[PDB]
Design a protein around this ligand. Structure first.
Ligand SMILES: *[C@@H]1O[C@H](CO)[C@@H](O[C@@H]2O[C@H](CO)[C@@H](O[C@@H]3O[C@H](CO)[C@@H](O)[C@H](O)[C@@H]3O)[C@H](O)[C@H]2NC(C)=O)[C@H](O)[C@H]1NC(C)=O
Ligand SMILES: *[C@@H]1O[C@H](CO)[C@@H](O[C@@H]2O[C@H](CO)[C@@H](O)[C@H](O)[C@H]2NC(C)=O)[C@H](O)[C@H]1NC(C)=O
Lengths: 657, 4
């Protein structure tokens, strides 16, 4: 539908040939709206040399800047540590000789235009980590497990602690780190201490003992803590940097189980707890807004002990939507989706014009299943996992199969433009895919064993496609790079050409600026209610107590949203109902439509929580607003609050007070 | 994801 497209692309396609790119090759973008890309290489000659290339134009042209690093061998293990935001910081870690006291880094503050070499008073063991508040503050662990901090972008270091296993930056330049006191990190597991320093090593506070590990998610600090006189451990949560802790209402686990924070934001967390006896699955729980009371969201959630692969995916392009895989009772794998932050999970709706595959019991009734990390790890023919971007609202693209379970067959690519409610087959056969200019353009490359020289693109969100031949020397295709954030109209195609005699790495960068030659205006956008189920209901669209309508680009408009495009939306607040509340600790919601009632008996970890929980959390009316829930007016449960503590501890003989 |  695009006219003269070949002529509009041909003078905007840019080839670069890399003279040498053997070994591990990596690419990092430096900053937003800079067009800066660094390509680094590392190979050994076994019976070490590194190459560094830099673009400042979104990959159209590179310059060999290997000379800047004195042709030194860069260790790929540490990668390029790119600083936050647009600080323009880059640190590369070098291999030193065997004589050396400490290692060596090459540091740049101007987007890798210039580097200086700095010799370290230690040998780094981890990648260097920037404070998110301050790109000049770095921390790093040494090979001797010292924790070292720098206040001047790695110019000078000081070791603030000697026996450290893990360290991370919190907010406001805070450091949390675990320490061992006995022998090694591994032999002191479960008896580590957790420390905090708010002032870069001047003061410390020990905020936990008998630690196994710790992590940060949203507003929460999580620590797993081992029960003394025991081999099991439990999660404890703090929202004040470990000044105070509460036990979370979650099962304890043995040494062969794990917890994993699937996703976390300012409101809540999704926690996975592995099932006992390494069955390769566990259960998803969602927290309230305190990170303390957890609701079982999804049983038999697939998460493998080998490598730790899970299909859990936030569909970033529609609020509330997540997708994952679960094991059926027959041990086939199905895809499930939730539209309300894990309150309910369902099968994905089959594309109207799809045929049910061989996994389907019924040839007229089946569902869509999605290939993701686990499929890829099992060596299925799946080039990419599912793609969605916050700024291209409603769009999700993924390889999938239509049936009753995930198939081993070669998959096709499906797209949804409503956040996952409905799907269509987008392309036949496996492809690599990218979204450019906030959904203004979708691009795809065929995944082949033979060389390719065509790229497909759509300006109407994957409904109609045009094919451009971007080279007359077909390449073995390796990968697509585009600027993080999906707001660019540049896409780079990477691969290599092979002859009998020789081969060579090549990139082609294509600029769509002449296809999308006009800016979108107000008339190019149309109102769209997200989550619509039934247009006859005044509450159609309500999720977590509010609806949103978006101004979405019309499919038929062919125009650029723009690098400064802002997703325009307008909320409507829904009335509160009982569905906007979670059962608080001690209560549940039996068979039907939504009244939280006292549990008759507390067993298992509920019983543990009652004995170990604070009054604050044990005093309740049985309801708590779903976190992120924005309803106003309507039902407001007025049952009076009671201490459930008295209920359980009532059975126990108490010792003297 | 983040293991504990
Ligand atoms: C796709 O890649 C091209 C580069 O090949 C990007 O072009 C860049 O476009 C930006 C904004 O249009 C230009 O930045 C401006 O620079 C001038 C002076 O240099 C300054 O006064 C402005 O305030 C602004 O910073 C930039 O010149 C240009 N880069 C080059 C090398 O030509 C293009 O933006 C990419 N397309 C998208 C949509 O991301
Ligand atoms: C699922 O992804 C969405 C989209 O990225 C996340 O929502 C963003 O979260 C951050 C941090 O709280 C906010 O600053 C942004 O405003 C949100 N973006 C949008 C478009 O809403 C969301 O938090 C993710 N879910 C979880 C549990 O992390």
């Amino acid at each position: 539908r695009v006219r003269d497209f070949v002529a509009k692309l041909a003078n905007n396609t840019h080839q670069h040939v890399f003279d040498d790119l053997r070994g591990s090759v990596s690419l990092s973008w430096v900053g937003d709206s800079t067009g800066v890309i660094l390509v680094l290489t590392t190979f050994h000659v076994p019976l070490g040399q590194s190459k560094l290339y830099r673009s400042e134009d979104y990959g159209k042209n590179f310059k060999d800047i290997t000379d800047l690093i004195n042709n030194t061998f860069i260790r790929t293990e540490f990668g390029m540590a790119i600083g936050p935001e647009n600080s323009g910081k880059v640190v590369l870690t070098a291999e030193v000789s065997g004589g050396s006291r400490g290692g060596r880094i090459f540091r740049s503050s101007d987007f890798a235009k210039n580097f200086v070499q700095t010799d370290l008073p230690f040998h780094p063991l981890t990648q260097m980590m920037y404070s998110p508040q301050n790109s000049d503050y770095l921390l790093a662990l040494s090979t001797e497990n010292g924790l070292w901090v720098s206040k001047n972008f790695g110019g000078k270091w000081e070791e603030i602690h000697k026996a450290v296993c893990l360290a991370k930056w919190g907010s406001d330049n805070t450091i949390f780190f675990t320490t061992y006191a006995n022998g090694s990190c591994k032999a002191d597991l479960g008896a580590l201490e957790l420390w905090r320093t708010s002032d870069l090593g001047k003061s410390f506070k020990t905020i936990g003992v008998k630690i196994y590990s710790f992590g940060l998610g949203g507003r929460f600090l999580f620590a797993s803590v081992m029960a003394d006189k025991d081999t099991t451990r439990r999660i404890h949560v703090s929202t004040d940097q470990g000044d105070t802790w509460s036990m979370a209402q979650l099962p304890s686990v043995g040494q062969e189980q794990f917890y994993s924070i699937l996703a976390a934001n300012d409101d809540m967390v999704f926690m996975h707890v592995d099932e006992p006896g390494d069955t390769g699955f566990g259960t998803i729980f969602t927290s309230d807004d305190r990170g303390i009371v957890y609701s079982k969201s999804l049983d038999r959630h697939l998460y493998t002990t080998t490598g730790g692969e899970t299909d859990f995916t936030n569909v970033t392009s529609l609020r509330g939507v997540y997708i994952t895989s679960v094991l059926s009772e027959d041990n086939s794998i199905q895809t499930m989706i939730t539209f309300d932050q894990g309150g309910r999970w369902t099968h994905l709706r089959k594309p109207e014009n799809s045929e049910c595959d061989a996994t389907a019991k019924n040839k007229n009734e089946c569902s869509l299943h999605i290939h993701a990390s686990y499929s890829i790890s099992q060596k299925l023919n799946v080039p990419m996992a599912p793609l969605s971007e916050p700024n291209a609202v409603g769009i999700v693209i993924a390889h999938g199969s239509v049936g009753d379970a995930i198939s081993v067959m070669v998959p096709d690519v499906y797209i949804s433009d409503d956040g996952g409610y409905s799907w269509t087959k987008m392309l036949e056969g496996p492809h690599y895919y990218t979204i450019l200019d906030s959904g203004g353009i979708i691009v795809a490359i065929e995944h082949s064993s033979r060389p390719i020289n065509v790229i497909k693109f759509s300006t109407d969100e994957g409904q109609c496609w045009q094919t451009y031949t971007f080279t007359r020397d077909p390449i073995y295709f390796t990968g697509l790079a585009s600027e993080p954030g999906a707001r660019s109209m540049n896409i780079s195609i990477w691969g290599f050409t092979e002859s009998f005699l020789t081969s060579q790495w090549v990139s082609y960068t294509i600029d769509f600026k002449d296809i999308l030659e006009r800016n979108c205006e107000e008339k190019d956008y149309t109102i769209w209610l997200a989550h619509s189920t039934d247009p006859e209901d005044y509450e159609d669209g309500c999720i977590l107590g509010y609806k949103e309508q978006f101004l979405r680009l019309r499919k038929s408009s062919m125009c650029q949203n723009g690098r400064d495009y802002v997703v325009t939306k307008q909320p409507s607040i829904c009335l509160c109902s009982l569905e906007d509340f979670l059962c608080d600790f001690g209560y549940y919601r039996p068979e039907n439509d939504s009244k939280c009632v006292e549990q008759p008996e507390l067993k298992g970890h509920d019983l543990e929580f009652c004995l170990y929980g604070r009054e604050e959390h044990l005093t309740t009316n049985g309801y708590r607003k779903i976190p992120g829930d924005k309803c106003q007016g309507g039902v407001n449960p007025v049952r009076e609050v009671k201490d459930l503590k008295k209920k359980c501890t009532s059975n126990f003989l108490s010792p003297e007070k | 994801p983040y293991i504990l």
